[PDB]
Design a protein around this ligand. Structure first.
Ligand SMILES: *[C@@H]1O[C@H](CO)[C@@H](O)[C@H](O)[C@H]1NC(C)=O
Ligand SMILES: [Cu+2]
Length: 605
């Protein structure tokens, strides 16, 4: 028995309307689709327009705008009077009416401040609706609710294009501890909009805080984390998980990268296992064996962190390059080549910056010219003002110097931001916060920014709805849209222990999808997209505008699997440019408009 008020609110019919009249009433003697506190991208209820005496504003009932106020005024008794007050306040785009206390808040200016939109019966929100030109600024869809906070996500490789996204958290949907023989997992078909969860127990792996690398045959190698030694192998073709060999050394928060030769190198990972610097190691899918590399020395890639060595070897910016090489772009001030020959190899390649940029974003946007984009991050893991500084790092031959040029500063300092390269080799940076503060919404940037490497300039994109900071993700989707999601998670001392004491306002068990400008004509209508009608055949390197993009895996601001291979409309010879593994074929009109990718499985000589 569910009484649904006209405006759309819903109780679980005489005291009921008594309760709907008192903004302070949850119980009587309230059960909306979303819980109270939930963040929203769109009004969950029937809105109302409203015109001022001199001639407009949209009103969403039972909702709040959180963030700094320009003004709070105690006089006001009515939404209409709060609305009036906004019109008379210079630069007022958003205002809040507090039913309980007869108060009107004018929200401070976006994007200088960030403002969020929450379900809350105590309030009503008023807004001068932004006219957003999708041709200049793209468009965000509405929050997608998910069973599991997507702390880690990867595209499941399929034919003729992928349809699914796995994501995972820890032993719980919204909480982590230490080791626990289990991970909570979520499966989102973005063709059907279908969503399922599952507990993965068979690999005895809590995969929270892991390394992630897609192998040659498109299996995903999930390494360490809460079960610091345990390795899990995800088989797209059976959607089942297999136990890989224990790493030589227990790690968490380390990065891994697939190499030229379909081996996987990892270095660092002082978060879990022993709390000391971790030297390199390399997985051979063929031997099905890990090999400790004592000469792949952690010490040169250490950041200097206020929290010490726990953090310093974390989230290295690793790329497989030519002839089994590894480039380390950061986050440490200085960059380094690493090799797996003999027992190791490490050498300085360049100085990128005069400060470390922990969890800064990083992407190889042009493999064929070894161009790497980097921006944001913070000198320390947490309690650290993020940087606006960005760089193109140019890499020629493995183990010779590399070229770093400071390009223009981002519009916003970002810690814990996420990045994807797009078919045109533009980079989309989403989320992150002014000051790295683990488990916070604080000063989450909502405006996406698109860096043009051809121009070396930034454009501000339309704003998303939720802050995407610690434990968030971004990842390219086959239809050339960006998925942005997660945030939060709560530490509890033991597995099973109650989550009741956790602040869930920082938990964002959901995502949202960006349609970049390139999907829109000058009139805001969706551009006509090139279609493709390709052999589903393992093609090898060097065999015969367009671009390939390797399927992404992503956690903790680390996307080690994504790589843009620009083409001649004809694959390149070098596997250290064309890393083997599953890609996206993007054919795009010479105005800039791309296809729904066709999946292309590159294999080794
Ligand atoms: C494509 O051809 C151009 C000249 O035709 C060449 O310089 C370039 O290296 C080739 N591929 C890419 C992606 O640049
Ligand atoms: Cu974490």
């Amino acid at each position: 028995t569910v009484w649904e008020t006209p405006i759309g609110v819903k109780y679980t019919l005489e005291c009921a309307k008594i309760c709907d009249s008192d903004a302070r009433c949850n119980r009587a003697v309230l059960t909306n689709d979303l819980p109270e506190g939930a963040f929203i991208s769109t009004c969950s209820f029937n809105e109302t327009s409203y015109r001022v005496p001199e001639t407009e504003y949209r009103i969403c009932p039972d909702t709040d705008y959180t963030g700094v106020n320009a003004k709070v005024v105690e006089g006001v008794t009515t939404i209409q009077a709060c609305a009036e007050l906004c019109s008379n306040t210079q630069d007022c785009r958003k205002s809040v009416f507090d039913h309980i206390n007869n108060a009107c808040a004018i929200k401070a200016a976006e994007p200088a401040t960030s403002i969020f939109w929450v379900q809350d019966k105590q309030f009503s929100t008023i807004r001068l609706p932004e006219n957003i030109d999708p041709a200049v600024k793209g468009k965000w869809g509405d929050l997608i609710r998910l069973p599991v906070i997507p702390v880690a996500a990867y595209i499941v490789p399929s034919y003729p294009e992928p349809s699914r996204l796995l994501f995972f958290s820890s032993w719980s949907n919204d909480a982590f501890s230490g080791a626990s023989g289990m991970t909570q997992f979520g499966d989102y078909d973005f063709a059907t909009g279908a969503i399922s969860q599952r507990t993965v127990t068979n690999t005895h792996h809590d995969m929270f805080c892991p390394g992630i690398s897609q192998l040659e045959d498109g299996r995903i190698l999930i390494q360490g984390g809460s079960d610091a030694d345990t390795v899990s192998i995800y088989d797209p073709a059976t959607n089942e998980f297999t136990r890989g060999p224990n790493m030589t050394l227990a790690r968490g928060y380390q990065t891994s990268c697939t190499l030229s030769n379909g081996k996987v190198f990892t270095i660092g990972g002082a978060y879990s296992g022993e709390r000391v610097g971790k030297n390199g190691e390399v997985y051979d899918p063929v031997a099905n064996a890990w090999t400790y590399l004592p000469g792949a020395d952690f010490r040169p890639m250490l950041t200097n962190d206020h929290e010490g060595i726990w953090r310093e070897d974390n989230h290295a910016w690793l790329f497989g390059w030519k002839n089994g090489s590894i480039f380390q772009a950061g986050p440490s001030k200085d960059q380094h080549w690493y090799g797996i020959q003999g027992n190791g190899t490490v050498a300085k390649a360049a100085t990128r910056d005069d400060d470390d940029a922990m969890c800064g974003v990083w992407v190889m946007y042009d493999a064929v010219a070894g161009k790497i984009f980097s921006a944001g991050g913070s000198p320390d893991y947490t309690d650290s003002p993020a940087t606006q500084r960005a760089h193109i790092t140019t890499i020629g031959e493995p183990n010779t110097p590399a070229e770093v040029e400071r390009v223009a500063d981002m519009g916003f300092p970002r810690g814990f931001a996420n990045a994807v390269v797009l078919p045109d080799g533009q980079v989309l940076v989403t989320g992150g916060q002014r000051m790295s503060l683990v488990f916070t919404n604080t000063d989450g940037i909502l405006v996406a920014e698109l860096f043009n490497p051809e121009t070396r300039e930034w454009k501000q994109m339309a704003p998303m709805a939720v802050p995407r900071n610690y434990h968030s993700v971004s990842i390219l989707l086959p239809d050339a849209t960006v998925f942005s999601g997660g945030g939060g998670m709560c530490w509890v001392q033991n597995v099973g222990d109650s989550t009741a004491g956790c602040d869930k306002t920082v938990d964002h068990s959901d995502g949202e999808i960006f349609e970049p400008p390139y999907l829109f004509n000058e009139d805001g209508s969706r551009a006509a997209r090139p279609v493709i009608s390709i052999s589903a055949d393992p093609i090898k390197a060097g065999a015969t505008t367009a671009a390939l993009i390797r399927l992404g895996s992503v956690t903790h601001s680390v996307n080690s699997d994504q790589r843009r291979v620009p083409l001649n409309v004809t694959l390149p010879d070098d596997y250290g440019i064309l890393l083997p593994g599953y890609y996206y074929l993007f054919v795009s009109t010479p105005q800039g408009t791309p296809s729904i990718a066709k999946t292309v499985h590159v294999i080794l000589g």
